[PDB]
mmCIF file of C-alpha atoms and ligand atoms in Angstrom:
data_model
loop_
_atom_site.group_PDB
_atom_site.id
_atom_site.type_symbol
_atom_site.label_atom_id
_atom_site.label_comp_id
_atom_site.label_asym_id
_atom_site.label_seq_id
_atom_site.Cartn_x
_atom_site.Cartn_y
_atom_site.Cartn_z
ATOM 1 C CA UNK W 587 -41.950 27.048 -5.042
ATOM 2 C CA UNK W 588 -42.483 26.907 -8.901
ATOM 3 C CA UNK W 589 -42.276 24.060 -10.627
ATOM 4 C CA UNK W 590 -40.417 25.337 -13.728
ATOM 5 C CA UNK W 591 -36.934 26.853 -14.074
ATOM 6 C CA UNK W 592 -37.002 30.474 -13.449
ATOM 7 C CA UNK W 593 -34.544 31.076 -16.781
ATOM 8 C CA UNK W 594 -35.305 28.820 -18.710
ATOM 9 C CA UNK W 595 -38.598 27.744 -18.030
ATOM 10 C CA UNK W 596 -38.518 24.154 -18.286
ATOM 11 C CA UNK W 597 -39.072 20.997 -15.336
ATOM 12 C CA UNK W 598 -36.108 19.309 -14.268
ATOM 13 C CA UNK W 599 -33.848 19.299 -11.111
ATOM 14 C CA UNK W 600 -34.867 22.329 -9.650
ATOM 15 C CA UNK W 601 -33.043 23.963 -6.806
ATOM 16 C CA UNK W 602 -35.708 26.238 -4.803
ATOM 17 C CA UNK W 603 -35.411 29.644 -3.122
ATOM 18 C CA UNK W 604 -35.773 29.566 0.576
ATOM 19 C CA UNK W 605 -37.069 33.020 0.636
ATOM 20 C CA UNK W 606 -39.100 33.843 -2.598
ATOM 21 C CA UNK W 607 -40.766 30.602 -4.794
ATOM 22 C CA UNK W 608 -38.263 31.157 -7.383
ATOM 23 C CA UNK W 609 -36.532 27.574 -8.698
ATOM 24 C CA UNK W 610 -33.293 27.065 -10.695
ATOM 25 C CA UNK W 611 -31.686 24.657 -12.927
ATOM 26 C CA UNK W 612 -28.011 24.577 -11.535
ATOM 27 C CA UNK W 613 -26.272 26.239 -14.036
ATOM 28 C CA UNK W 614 -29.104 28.634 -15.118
ATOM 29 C CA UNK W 615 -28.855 30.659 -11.829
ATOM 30 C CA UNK W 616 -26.089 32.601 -11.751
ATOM 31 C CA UNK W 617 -23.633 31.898 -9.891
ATOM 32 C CA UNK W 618 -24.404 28.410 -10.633
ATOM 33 C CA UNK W 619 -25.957 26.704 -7.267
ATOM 34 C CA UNK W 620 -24.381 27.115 -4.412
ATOM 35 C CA UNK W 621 -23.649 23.191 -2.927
ATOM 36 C CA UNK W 622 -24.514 23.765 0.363
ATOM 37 C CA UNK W 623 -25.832 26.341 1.873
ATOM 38 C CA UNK W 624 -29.332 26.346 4.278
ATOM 39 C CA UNK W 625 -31.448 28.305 3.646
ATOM 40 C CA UNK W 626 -30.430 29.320 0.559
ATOM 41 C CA UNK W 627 -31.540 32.842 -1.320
ATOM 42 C CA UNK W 628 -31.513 33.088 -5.297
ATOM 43 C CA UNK W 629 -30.100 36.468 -7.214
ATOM 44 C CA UNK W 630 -33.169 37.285 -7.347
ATOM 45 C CA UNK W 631 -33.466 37.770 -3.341
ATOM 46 C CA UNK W 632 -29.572 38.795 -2.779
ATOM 47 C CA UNK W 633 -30.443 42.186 -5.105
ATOM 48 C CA UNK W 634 -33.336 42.891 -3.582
ATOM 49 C CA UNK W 635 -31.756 42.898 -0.094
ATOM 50 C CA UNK W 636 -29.129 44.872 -1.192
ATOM 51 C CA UNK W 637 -31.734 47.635 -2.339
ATOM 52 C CA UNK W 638 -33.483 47.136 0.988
ATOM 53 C CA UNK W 639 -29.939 47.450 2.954
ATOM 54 C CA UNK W 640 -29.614 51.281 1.205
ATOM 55 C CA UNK W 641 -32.468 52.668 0.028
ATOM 56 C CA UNK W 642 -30.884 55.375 -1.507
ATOM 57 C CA UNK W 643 -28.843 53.457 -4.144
ATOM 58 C CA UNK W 644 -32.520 53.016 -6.103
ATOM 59 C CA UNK W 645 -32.167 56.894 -6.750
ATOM 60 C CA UNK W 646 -30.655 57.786 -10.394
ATOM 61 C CA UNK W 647 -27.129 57.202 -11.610
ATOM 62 C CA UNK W 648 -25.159 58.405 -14.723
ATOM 63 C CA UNK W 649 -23.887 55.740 -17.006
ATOM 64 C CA UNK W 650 -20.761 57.214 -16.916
ATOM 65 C CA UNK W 651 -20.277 56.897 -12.958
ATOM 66 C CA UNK W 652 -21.586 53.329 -12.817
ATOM 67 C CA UNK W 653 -19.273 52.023 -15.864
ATOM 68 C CA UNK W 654 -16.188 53.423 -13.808
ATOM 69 C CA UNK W 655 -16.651 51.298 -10.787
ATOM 70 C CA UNK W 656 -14.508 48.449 -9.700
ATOM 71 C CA UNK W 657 -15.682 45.175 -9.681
ATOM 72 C CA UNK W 658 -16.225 44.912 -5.667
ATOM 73 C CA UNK W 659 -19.126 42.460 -4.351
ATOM 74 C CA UNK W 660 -21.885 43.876 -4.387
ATOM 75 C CA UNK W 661 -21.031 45.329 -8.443
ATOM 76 C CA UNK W 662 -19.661 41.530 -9.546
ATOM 77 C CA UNK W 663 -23.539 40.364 -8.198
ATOM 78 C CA UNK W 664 -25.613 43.230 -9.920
ATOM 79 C CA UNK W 665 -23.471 42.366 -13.546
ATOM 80 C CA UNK W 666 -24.308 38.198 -12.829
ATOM 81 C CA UNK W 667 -28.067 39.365 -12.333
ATOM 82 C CA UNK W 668 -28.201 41.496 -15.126
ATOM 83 C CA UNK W 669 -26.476 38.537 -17.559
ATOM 84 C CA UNK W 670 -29.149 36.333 -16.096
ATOM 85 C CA UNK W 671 -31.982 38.546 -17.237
ATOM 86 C CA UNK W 672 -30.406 38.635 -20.643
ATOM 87 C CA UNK W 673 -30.595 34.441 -20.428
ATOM 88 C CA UNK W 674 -34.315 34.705 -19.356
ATOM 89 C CA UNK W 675 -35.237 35.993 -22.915
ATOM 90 C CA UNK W 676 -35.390 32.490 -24.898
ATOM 91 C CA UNK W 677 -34.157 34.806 -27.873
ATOM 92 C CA UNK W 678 -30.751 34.572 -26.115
ATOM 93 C CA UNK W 679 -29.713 31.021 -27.493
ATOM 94 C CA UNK W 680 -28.780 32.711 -30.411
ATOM 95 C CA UNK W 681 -26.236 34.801 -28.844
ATOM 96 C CA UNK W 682 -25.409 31.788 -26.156
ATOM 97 C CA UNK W 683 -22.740 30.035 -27.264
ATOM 98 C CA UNK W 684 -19.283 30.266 -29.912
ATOM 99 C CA UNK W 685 -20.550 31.902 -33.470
ATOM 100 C CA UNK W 686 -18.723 31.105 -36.302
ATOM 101 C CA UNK W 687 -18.984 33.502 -39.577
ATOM 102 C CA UNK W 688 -19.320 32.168 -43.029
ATOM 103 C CA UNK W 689 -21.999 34.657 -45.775
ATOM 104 C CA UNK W 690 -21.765 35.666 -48.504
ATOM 105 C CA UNK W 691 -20.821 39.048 -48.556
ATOM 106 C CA UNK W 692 -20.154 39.263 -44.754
ATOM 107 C CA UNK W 693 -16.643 39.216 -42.639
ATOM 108 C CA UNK W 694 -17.038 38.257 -39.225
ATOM 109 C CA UNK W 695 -16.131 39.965 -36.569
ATOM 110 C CA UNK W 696 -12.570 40.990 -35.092
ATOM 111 C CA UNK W 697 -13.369 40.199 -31.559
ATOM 112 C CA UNK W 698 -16.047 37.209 -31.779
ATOM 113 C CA UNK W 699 -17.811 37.671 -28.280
ATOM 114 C CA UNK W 700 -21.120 35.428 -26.777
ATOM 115 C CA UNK W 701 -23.013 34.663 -23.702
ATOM 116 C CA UNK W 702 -20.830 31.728 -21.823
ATOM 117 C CA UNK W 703 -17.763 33.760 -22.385
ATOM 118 C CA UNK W 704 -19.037 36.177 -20.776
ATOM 119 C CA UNK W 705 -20.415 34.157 -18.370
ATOM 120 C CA UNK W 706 -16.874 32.071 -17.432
ATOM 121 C CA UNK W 707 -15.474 35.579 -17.606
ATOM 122 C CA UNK W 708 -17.575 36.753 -14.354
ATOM 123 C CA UNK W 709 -16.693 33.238 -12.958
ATOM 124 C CA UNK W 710 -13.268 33.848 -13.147
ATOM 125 C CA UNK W 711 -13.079 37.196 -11.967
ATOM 126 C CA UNK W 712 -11.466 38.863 -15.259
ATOM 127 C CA UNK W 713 -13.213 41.784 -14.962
ATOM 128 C CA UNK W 714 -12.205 44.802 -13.095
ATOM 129 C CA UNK W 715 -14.882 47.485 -13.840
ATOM 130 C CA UNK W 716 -18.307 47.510 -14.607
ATOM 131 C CA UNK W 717 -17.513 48.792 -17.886
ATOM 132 C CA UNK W 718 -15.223 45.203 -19.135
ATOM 133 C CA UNK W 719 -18.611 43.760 -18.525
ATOM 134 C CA UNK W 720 -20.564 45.827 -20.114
ATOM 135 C CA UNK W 721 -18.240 46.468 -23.036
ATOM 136 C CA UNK W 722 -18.715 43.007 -23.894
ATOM 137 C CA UNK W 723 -22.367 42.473 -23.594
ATOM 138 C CA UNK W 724 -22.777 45.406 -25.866
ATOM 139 C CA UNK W 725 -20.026 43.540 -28.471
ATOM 140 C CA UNK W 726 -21.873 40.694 -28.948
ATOM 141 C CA UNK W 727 -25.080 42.643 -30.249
ATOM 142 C CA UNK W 728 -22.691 45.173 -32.131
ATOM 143 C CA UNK W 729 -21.265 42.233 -34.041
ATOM 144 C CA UNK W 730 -24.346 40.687 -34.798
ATOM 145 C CA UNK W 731 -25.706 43.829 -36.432
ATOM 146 C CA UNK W 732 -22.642 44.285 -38.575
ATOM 147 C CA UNK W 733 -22.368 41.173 -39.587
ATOM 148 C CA UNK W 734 -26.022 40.682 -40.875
ATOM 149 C CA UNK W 735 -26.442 43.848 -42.793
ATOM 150 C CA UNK W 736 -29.466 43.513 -44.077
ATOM 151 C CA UNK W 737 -30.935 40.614 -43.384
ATOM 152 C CA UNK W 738 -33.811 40.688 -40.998
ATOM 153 C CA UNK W 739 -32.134 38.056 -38.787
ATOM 154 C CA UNK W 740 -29.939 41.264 -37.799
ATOM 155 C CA UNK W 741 -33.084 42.102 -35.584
ATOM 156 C CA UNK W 742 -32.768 39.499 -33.075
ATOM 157 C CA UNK W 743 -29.764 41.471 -32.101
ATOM 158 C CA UNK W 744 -31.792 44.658 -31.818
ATOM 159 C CA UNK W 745 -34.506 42.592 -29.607
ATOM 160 C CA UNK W 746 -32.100 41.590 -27.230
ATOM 161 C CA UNK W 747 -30.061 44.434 -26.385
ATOM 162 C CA UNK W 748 -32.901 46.092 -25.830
ATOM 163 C CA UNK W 749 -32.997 43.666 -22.750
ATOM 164 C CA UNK W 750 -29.857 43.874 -21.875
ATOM 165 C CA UNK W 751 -30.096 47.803 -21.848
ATOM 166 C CA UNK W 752 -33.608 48.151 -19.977
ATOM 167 C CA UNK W 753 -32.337 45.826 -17.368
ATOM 168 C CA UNK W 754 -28.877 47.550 -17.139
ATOM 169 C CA UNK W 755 -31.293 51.121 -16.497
ATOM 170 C CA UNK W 756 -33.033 49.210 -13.912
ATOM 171 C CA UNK W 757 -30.341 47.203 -11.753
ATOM 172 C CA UNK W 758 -27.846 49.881 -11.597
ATOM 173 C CA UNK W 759 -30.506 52.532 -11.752
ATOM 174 C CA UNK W 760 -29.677 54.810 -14.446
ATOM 175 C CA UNK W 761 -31.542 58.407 -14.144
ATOM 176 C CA UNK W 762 -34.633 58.357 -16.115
ATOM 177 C CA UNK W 763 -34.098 60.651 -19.160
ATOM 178 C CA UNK W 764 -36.092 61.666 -22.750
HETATM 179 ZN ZN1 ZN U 1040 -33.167 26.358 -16.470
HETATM 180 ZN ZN1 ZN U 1041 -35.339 34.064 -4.197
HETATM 181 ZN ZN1 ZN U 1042 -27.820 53.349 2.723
#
């Protein structure tokens, strides 16, 4: 197995895949850790046997179709995954935790939305369609850019929805368009 987190990249107490050399903080996989559980398999491998399991859900999807479905088991796992890719950018502290909103010039944002929320949100099971989940990952880069105008810092936002929105094409393969 590696010897660095797999999301975060740093040494610690590392939890290893039993069937890929992926390691894991506890509460950088997602779901955190499972206690017991031998052998155990990482996101990483549960997605992967799901595509193996139905080859056919690899070909293309419209958006539209994918945002509509209910939150069943196999959906609630492909939304943690994608939320952990978004975490494996290091650019993602900045979106990680509670903002607060105090420029000059600025008004924050009528629904304030970030990372863990959505996070305990998925724990919790408040979402019922894809599209709850997705309405709020999309949120917290929206507010970001209209909060920051013009300042440059307003690109981080840009740089990590495009993330977010390359790995939501991928995991719930989206049909390939111009
Ligand atoms: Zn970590
Ligand atoms: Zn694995
Ligand atoms: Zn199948």
């Amino acid at each position: 197995n590696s010897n660095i987190c797999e999301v975060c990249n740093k040494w610690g107490r590392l939890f290893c895949c039993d069937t890929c050399p992926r390691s894991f903080h506890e509460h950088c996989h997602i779901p955190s850790v499972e206690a017991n559980k031998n052998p155990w398999s990482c996101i990483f491998c549960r997605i992967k046997t799901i595509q193996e399991r139905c080859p056919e859900s690899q070909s293309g999807h419209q958006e539209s179709e994918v945002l509509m479905r209910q939150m069943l088991p196999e959906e609630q796992l492909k939304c943690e995954f994608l939320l952990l890719k978004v975490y494996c950018d290091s650019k993602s502290c900045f979106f990680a935790s509670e903002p607060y909103y105090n420029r000059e010039g600025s008004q924050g944002p009528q629904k304030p939305m970030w990372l863990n929320k959505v996070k305990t949100s998925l724990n919790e099971q408040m979402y019922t369609r894809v599209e709850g989940f997705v309405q709020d990952m999309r949120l917290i880069f929206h507010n970001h850019k209209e909060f920051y105008r013009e300042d440059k810092f307003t690109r981080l936002g840009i740089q990590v929805q495009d993330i977010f929105e390359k790995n939501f094409r991928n995991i719930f393969a989206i049909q390939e368009t111009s």
